């Protein structure tokens, strides 16, 4: 019970990667950053709305909903090259 199947896509190139539970954002992010060699951002798109992965809270919510949905199987994540977005602070709460 520890092998999540995640599908990553970069510039049209798709790849199949498995992650043994518990799946941590640090482990996943560290792998993506090393493979591509850059701080890429993960975007979780459900269908109608888009969620940005900033912390574990975002990933935890995404996995919780995905697991709840028996219909769903793989994870749809979009990789983007967003290394430092200008010199400022963006906080909303």
Question: What is the token pair recorded at 85?
Answer: 């977005």
Collapsing DSSP to helix, strand or coil, 8 comes out as strand
Class for the domain spanning 2-69: alpha beta
Domain ranges of the chain: 2-69
CA dist 42 and 78 (Å) reads: 6
CB-count exposure of residue 76 (10 Å: 0-12, 13-18, 19+): middle
PDB experimental method: NMR
Check whether the bond before 22 is cis (ω within 30° of 0): yes
Strands 13-19 and 40-45: unpaired
């Amino acid at each position: 019970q520890s092998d999540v199947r995640i599908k990553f896509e970069h510039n049209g190139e798709r790849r199949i990667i498995a992650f043994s539970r518990p799946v941590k954002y640090e482990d996943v992010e560290h792998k993506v950053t090393t493979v591509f060699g850059q701080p890429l951002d993960l975007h979780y798109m459900n269908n109608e709305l888009s969620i940005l992965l900033k912390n574990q809270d975002d990933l935890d919510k995404a996995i919780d909903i995905l697991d709840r949905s028996s219909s769903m199987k793989s994870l749809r994540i979009l990789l983007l090259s967003q290394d430092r977005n200008l010199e400022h602070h963006h906080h909303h709460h």
